[PDB]
């Protein structure tokens, strides 16, 4: 008799039984079939020690809350360990040979530790995967509304390239936007409408050329460096008009419907819509060999060496 | 169905209808008034198989609206797709033109991918550099023997 485990959990999978003890941090592996004690040469104390130990452990720990399910069962475990197992059920839920045992139990302790960490990690990461899928499906609704609000930006984000979009009923027709170099685009000084006093342009006028040597083409500055071919964005004049417009990598600032100033994005206070998540990698670690006593030390502990 | 009652949101359960009991009409034009049309196609549906026919207008995401007030001024070059059952109905020039499945429409995703895989079961076999029999045998002379 080596160990008495008052809490051994048996789990069946892979066509095998796993007997895990949290107290001694050990996981034994057996086959599903029961190992016959008649196969053991001179093994009469296995049953008597097992029955005595199981009864004493049951009377001390499980007497009032659990019941025994059948007689003790015997299983042969990898490494050569004979497990006598008395299953318990909650009260609310009711030829001879010699076994060779390895001197090293750390395989089973590694099994226990790896199984524990693996089960925790798998459970947590699966919960995260389910939550992520649910969040994506849940955000699809917000995307459906935002598509109606701004087809151009939503299409560009969900397609992966700058496109113009229009909702053709319940689907979204798209078309690739032709790029234009920023140096080929300039903004006009005055945002007022020459023909009609009392009305102005909502967004500043621009002059751009598709190529360096191409002819000049008039237009109106759209959103996010878009060049609109039609200058129809018109609003009634309003006093105290102060606007910033995206232009290239920065902003053009217009005051009183006239070009006023220029800014970079570093000159504007920045607030974040992003939620921070700082995940760092677990670092490499090296395990050096380590022994309490070398086998030379164990050999030398004897007082007299017969050979020498 | 929902409605903002100020700062809270009144809701009412929608009654389901089988798609076989719903058909769409050919023409989206308004019979009485030329120059104006229906924004979304008209439908005829029955609450049950043997029930009487009931007119209506196709809403959003297979919704059956009892009132045909979705009206827009007529516009040339009118091409629309409307969700219907598991697919789309394609209307051209305010008239029924075609029907499509979701597989016939190019699909883009709003979802961010996350591929999480489970750590796999590993078995630790017993392993010793020297068995205790090997350590016993390393001695040159065994006194007992």
């Amino acid at each position: 008799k080596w160990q008495e485990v008052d809490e051994m959990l048996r789990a069946e999978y892979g066509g095998s039984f796993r007997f895990s003890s949290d107290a001694i941090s050990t996981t034994f592996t057996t086959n599903l079939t029961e190992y016959s004690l008649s196969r053991v040469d001179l093994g009469d104390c296995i049953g008597r020690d097992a029955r005595e130990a199981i009864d004493r452990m049951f009377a001390r720990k499980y007497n009032a809350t659990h019941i025994k399910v059948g007689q003790p069962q015997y299983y042969l475990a990898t490494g050569g360990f004979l497990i006598a197992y008395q299953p318990l059920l909650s009260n609310t839920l009711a030829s001879v040979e010699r076994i060779k045992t390895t001197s090293s139990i750390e395989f089973a302790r590694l099994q226990f530790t790896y199984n524990h960490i693996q089960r925790h990690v798998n459970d947590m990461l699966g919960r995260i995967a389910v939550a992520w899928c649910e969040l994506q499906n849940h955000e699809l609704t917000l995307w459906n509304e935002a598509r109606k609000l701004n087809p151009n930006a939503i299409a560009s984000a969900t397609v992966g390239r700058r496109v113009s979009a229009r909702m053709l009923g319940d689907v979204m027709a798209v078309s690739t936007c032709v790029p234009v170099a920023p140096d080929n685009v300039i903004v006009q000084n005055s945002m007022r409408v020459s023909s009609r006093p009392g009305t102005c342009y909502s967004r500043p006028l621009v002059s751009f050329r598709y190529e360096d040597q191409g002819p000049l083409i008039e237009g109106q500055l759209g959103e996010n460096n878009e060049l609109r071919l039609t200058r129809d964005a018109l609003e009634p004049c309003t006093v105290g008009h102060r606007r910033y417009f995206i232009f290239g990598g920065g902003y053009v600032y217009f005051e009183e419907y006239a070009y006023s100033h220029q800014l970079s994005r570093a000159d504007v206070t920045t607030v974040s819509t992003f939620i921070d998540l700082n995940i760092t990698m677990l670092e490499d670690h090296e395990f050096v060999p380590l022994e309490v006593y070398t086998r030379h030390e164990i050999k030398d502990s004897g007082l007299l060496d017969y050979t020498e | 169905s929902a409605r903002m009652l100020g700062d809270v949101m009144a809701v009412s359960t929608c009654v389901p209808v089988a798609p076989d009991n719903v058909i769409v009409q050919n023409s989206m034009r308004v019979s009485s008034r030329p120059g104006t049309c229906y924004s979304r196609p008209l439908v005829s549906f029955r609450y049950e198989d043997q029930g009487p026919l009931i007119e209506g207008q196709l809403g959003e995401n297979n919704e059956l609206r009892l009132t045909r007030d979705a009206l827009e001024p007529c516009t040339v070059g009118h091409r629309r797709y409307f969700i219907f059952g598991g697919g789309y109905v394609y209307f051209e020039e305010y008239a029924y033109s075609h029907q499509l499945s979701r597989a016939d429409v190019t699909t883009v995703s709003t979802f961010i991918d996350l591929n999480i895989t489970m750590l796999e079961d590993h078995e630790f076999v017993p392993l010793e550099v020297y068995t205790r029999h090997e350590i016993k045998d390393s001695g040159l002379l065994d006194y007992t023997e």
Partner: peptide, 15 residues
Amino acid sequence: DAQFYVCPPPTGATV
């Protein structure tokens, strides 16, 4: 991205 873009009206060619 500082590049500008000219976007023609989206026809129903690709939806």
